[PDB]
Amino acid sequence: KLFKKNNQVNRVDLDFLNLVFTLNDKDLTSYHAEEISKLTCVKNFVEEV
C-alpha cells in the first residue's frame, strides 16, 4: 500500500510506445506495414486533419 500508490502518478507505459516489441512477433507481415505507414501518414489523413 505504501509502495503501490504512486503508480497512478509516475507510471509510464513502455508498451504504448511499442517498446515491448519482442512479444509482438508472431502476428505481422510487412506488405501492409510500409504501405499503411506511408498511406495513412500522408494521403489517408490529409483529408482528415
Partner: protein, 97 residues
Amino acid sequence: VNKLRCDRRPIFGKNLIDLLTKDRRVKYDKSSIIDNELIKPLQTRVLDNRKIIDTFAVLTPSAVSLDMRKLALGLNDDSSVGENTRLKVMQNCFEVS
C-alpha cells in the same frame, strides 16, 4: 497514433511468423510407424508399470504443513493473482489426464 502505433513491429526486424512457419515447416509424410513399441512413450511406460508402483510405493512424509501446498503456486483466499486467472488455471489443468 499514426506516428506511434500505425506500423511499428510489422516491419520484420527480429522475425515474422510466416518466416517461422516456412522454417519450422516439415517435409515428412509418414515415418516411424513402430512408434508402437520402438519409441514406447513414457505416458505408456508409467501405466505399463502399474503393478510395481502399487506394490512398492510405501514411504510417506513424516510431516506436512497444510496451506503451503496451495500457496506454492500463489493462489489462496488472500493472494496477488487475478480473479478469473486462478480458476482458469485449474480449468485448463483439471482436464489434464
